[PDB]
Amino acid sequence: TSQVRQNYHQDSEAAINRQINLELYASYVYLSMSYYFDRDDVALKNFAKYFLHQSHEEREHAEKLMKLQNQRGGRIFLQDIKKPDCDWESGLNAMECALHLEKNVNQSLLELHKLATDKNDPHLCDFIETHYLNEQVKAIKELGDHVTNLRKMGAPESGLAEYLFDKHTLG
Amino acid sequence: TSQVRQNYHQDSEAAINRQINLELYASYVYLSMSYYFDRDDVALKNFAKYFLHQSHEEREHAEKLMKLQNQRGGRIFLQDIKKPDCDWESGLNAMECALHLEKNVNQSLLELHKLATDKNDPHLCDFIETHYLNEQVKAIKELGDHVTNLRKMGAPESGLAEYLFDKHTLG
Amino acid sequence: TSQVRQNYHQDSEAAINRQINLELYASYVYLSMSYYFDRDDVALKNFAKYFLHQSHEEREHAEKLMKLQNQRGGRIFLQDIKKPDCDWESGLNAMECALHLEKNVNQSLLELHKLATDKNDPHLCDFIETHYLNEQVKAIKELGDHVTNLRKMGAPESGLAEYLFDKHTLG
Amino acid sequence: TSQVRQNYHQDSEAAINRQINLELYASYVYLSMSYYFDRDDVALKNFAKYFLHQSHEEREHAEKLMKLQNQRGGRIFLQDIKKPDCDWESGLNAMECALHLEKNVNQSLLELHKLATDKNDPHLCDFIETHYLNEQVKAIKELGDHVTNLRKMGAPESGLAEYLFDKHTLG
Amino acid sequence: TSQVRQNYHQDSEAAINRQINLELYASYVYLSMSYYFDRDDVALKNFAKYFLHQSHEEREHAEKLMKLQNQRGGRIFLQDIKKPDCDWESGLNAMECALHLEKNVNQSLLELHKLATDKNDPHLCDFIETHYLNEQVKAIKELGDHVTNLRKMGAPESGLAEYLFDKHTLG
Amino acid sequence: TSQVRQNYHQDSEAAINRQINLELYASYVYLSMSYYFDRDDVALKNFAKYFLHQSHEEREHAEKLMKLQNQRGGRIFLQDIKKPDCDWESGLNAMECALHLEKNVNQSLLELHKLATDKNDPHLCDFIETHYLNEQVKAIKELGDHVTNLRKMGAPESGLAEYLFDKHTLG
Ligand SMILES: [Cl-]
Ligand SMILES: [Cl-]
Ligand SMILES: [Cl-]
Ligand SMILES: [Cl-]
Ligand SMILES: [Cl-]
Ligand SMILES: [Cl-]
Ligand SMILES: [Fe+3]
Ligand SMILES: [Fe+3]
Ligand SMILES: [Fe+3]
Ligand SMILES: [Fe+3]
Ligand SMILES: [Fe+3]
Ligand SMILES: [Fe+3]
Ligand SMILES: [Fe+3]
Ligand SMILES: [Fe+3]
Numbered sequence A, B, C, D, E, F: 001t002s003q004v005r006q007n008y009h010q011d012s013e014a015a016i017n018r019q020i021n022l023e024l025y026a027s028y029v030y031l032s033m034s035y036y037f038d039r040d041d042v043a044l045k046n047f048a049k050y051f052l053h054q055s056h057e058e059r060e061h062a063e064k065l066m067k068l069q070n071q072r073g074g075r076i077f078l079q080d081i082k083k084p085d086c087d088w089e090s091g092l093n094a095m096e097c098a099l100h101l102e103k104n105v106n107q108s109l110l111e112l113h114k115l116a117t118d119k120n121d122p123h124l125c126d127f128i129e130t131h132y133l134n135e136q137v138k139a140i141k142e143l144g145d146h147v148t149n150l151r152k153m154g155a156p157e158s159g160l161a162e163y164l165f166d167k168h169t170l171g
């Protein structure tokens, strides 16, 4: 029992542990997407850099939830990080799968907030709002914008489209 | 139907469209107040600059709600911007009408927040808190302070009062 | 009756009030065009910035006519700002509608100048020439140039065209 | 009755007055703790500076709640500041009493937030979250860390422990 | 019994403890005066800053007497800080009450010096002369100067007077 | 079949995929060790920073083997990252477990080199020598040095030992 713990429910402590695992899974998916574009048979350098930066951001999102667990007096509990569920076939197909991943992560964060509201934990509500909810909203909007451009340009059939998008939008 | 929309109720999307129209109406009122003080028969230069800056701020408040509608996957819907409801007769009477306008805009924002709370939209609650609620509180306090000074100085009878307030408080 | 008024006809004072309303209407149309390109299903960032800058310019054109009314001893009279008359369907269709708007605003300014010539108001003629007539001529030429490029590139069918125009001409 | 007051309940106005008194009491306790370490029979200079800085922070927390009362149109109501409830016997015993004080102040702030939630005051909820709740969480964690180090080093029996902690952790 | 104590009488040690309490009471009175001028129904910003600076100075006067108690080998003994004895009704009435407070604090310091002279404590006499007696003389003179200006200007009836004093003398 | 592949055996391509998984496992172990020292009941800040830096280094070791797979024309194949096998009980016990981990990673790299020598792959031998073998030798030596210091200082019984090591060697 922690000398610092106060107003922190056991169900919130477990939900934070489940959230950490998800953030580490998203980092793994973005790492797989990055090295697919570094292959000699795909070769889109800016797509690779974009997905590698997204992988590093998800690892920072996980480390800050681990900081929070200890700040409130909970105890961290880790599980296996699952292999990504997948072949990426093109620049367009990868951005669409990244859009569905960020919407999944956003649904979990909204569920975590409902729980923290039921347990009357206002410090935890503000933590989630401050550091996670507008970041997901901005990230999902950006991926939607990217998917729209690739399609209007002629992807996935026009191989010229993904090459020029690589230079102008990601470059 | 929007590929980015998530946890965003149709009633919240309509209430945001109504909010935009109000912000544009406040910009119009402040523009009318500014050019009344630029008249040769009134001639208070610092009152004119103060009200013109307030007009530009309300236009920025409107553009950021239009940014938000698109971020969440809603669709903007515009209506006519009504002519201001009015003659401004003095520096004091104009500050009192500006105080009643900012309290009207604050009542609408509080209603928008109650709705967003009923629909369990925590990203929208935090958006309103972060960018709108303490700004209205600071603005209403400032106008109250200004009205109190003009009255204690002898306005609207002392024409010396509004001249000296123009130089010391707004100058 | 104004201690500063001289050689300033009542018909010129009313025509200036009508001109102000038009400038504010053009600002509203350009604001609607800007946020259409910020939508997740269109996503042309440079088209959005171009139309937002045009909206701010029309608001400056209106504020300077309000300055002029007071300089000559007239009195400002405001009316409702009408909702824009419209769906924008593409980058090309929006530039064509902007070209027709700037030609409408130019026809009103030419009518205002004919009136000021009939009333032998040479200060008002020079004001319109100095600050409004070559600006409309330059603006209409620019929009004509933009429309010509989009068509020759394959718009509105080639979705690649509007993407590349966004980067090279507006970027 | 205040020309600026809006959506601000009498029960919230009284609870804010009670909160101010508590913040001033915490400043007084930290001032007593500081000068105990400045005594010739204790002589821990860095312990004295640490507790004096904590006293100044609590006085800033009180002044900002007094600013808030006036911002919302309430009226400040002051009571006597009670003498601290105490002999501090060592560096360890003082950090443990500071940990219990910061947890008491946090329980009052959580009660104030529940009240503001019942009265549907969202500006007051965000004020408390922004400026008070993560500060208490960070402060309680820091004191827990300090207590743990002193005990593991051999306090309160090892007089070497508190001397070396003074130089390395607070120095 | 203190290894450092020398030529320091028990009656001087108790009189220093009583002096500390008074300095903390003066800080509390100046804090109440400051936030009265921050109210929306008074609104004199420079009066508020002046009284807040005076509150911080009285807290420094108290901390230096606590430093002195320990320097000479005495032991600090704290009592409750009483609520201020009061409604401030105007800028003039507040300066007059501040003038009577600083004369009360000066009478206590003169009594403390008589005692230190009877006990032949020359280090304590010089301490009081160096750090306290000319400061009270300068402070009382300044308040007398301020009261004289407000009255000659027409206070408390002329509300213009306190506004202009706020800008010129305190601004 | 890869247009760039040359002198690169299928058994080497699989052994590189197994090596990647191990590097990611070591990053996970070092991340768990870091947040154990950030707990309020342990509180060794420099131990936490040391283990977090080691976690980031192992992730860089993995990304460079993924770069190498693609450089030679192989294809990356990912597996689940296993949860760490463990309670860390003290600073000493954690350094000893880190020493055994780095010796395990070194045994795998030596096996990978024997295989690359059997298949006469000299580019792969030099890659492993250049970027991995002296790094493990330096890392194992450093951990041995750390374990020796903690024991000679009195760990795990002397809680003073791990505190002072935290400040002098890691600080
Ligand atoms: Cl708890
Ligand atoms: Cl939805
Ligand atoms: Cl005329
Ligand atoms: Cl109210
Ligand atoms: Cl003595
Ligand atoms: Cl081969
Ligand atoms: Fe991201
Ligand atoms: Fe994330
Ligand atoms: Fe404003
Ligand atoms: Fe607004
Ligand atoms: Fe233009
Ligand atoms: Fe124009
Ligand atoms: Fe603190
Ligand atoms: Fe506090």
Ligand SMILES: [Fe+3]
Pocket: A126, A129, A130, B126, B129, B130, D126, D129, D130
């Ligand atoms: Fe918030």
Ligand SMILES: [Fe+3]
Pocket: E054, E057, E139
């Ligand atoms: Fe003073």
Ligand SMILES: [Fe+3]
Pocket: E023, E026, E057, E058, E061, E105
């Ligand atoms: Fe004093």
Ligand SMILES: [Fe+3]
Pocket: E126, E129, E130
């Ligand atoms: Fe002297």
Ligand SMILES: [Fe+3]
Pocket: F054, F057, F139
């Ligand atoms: Fe390492």
Ligand SMILES: [Fe+3]
Pocket: F023, F026, F057, F058, F061, F105
């Ligand atoms: Fe490694």
Ligand SMILES: [Mg+2]
Pocket: A083, F080
């Ligand atoms: Mg599996």
Ligand SMILES: [Mg+2]
Pocket: A129, A130, A134, B130
């Ligand atoms: Mg935010």
Ligand SMILES: [Mg+2]
Pocket: B083, C080
């Ligand atoms: Mg009407």
Ligand SMILES: [Mg+2]
Pocket: A125, B125, D125
């Ligand atoms: Mg909330």
Ligand SMILES: [Mg+2]
Pocket: B129, B130, B134, D130
């Ligand atoms: Mg804020």
Ligand SMILES: [Mg+2]
Pocket: B080, C083
């Ligand atoms: Mg209509």
Ligand SMILES: [Mg+2]
Pocket: C129, C130, C134
């Ligand atoms: Mg010209």
Ligand SMILES: [Mg+2]
Pocket: D083, E080
């Ligand atoms: Mg008592």
Ligand SMILES: [Mg+2]
Pocket: A130, D129, D130, D134
């Ligand atoms: Mg915060």
Ligand SMILES: [Mg+2]
Pocket: D080, E083
């Ligand atoms: Mg009493």
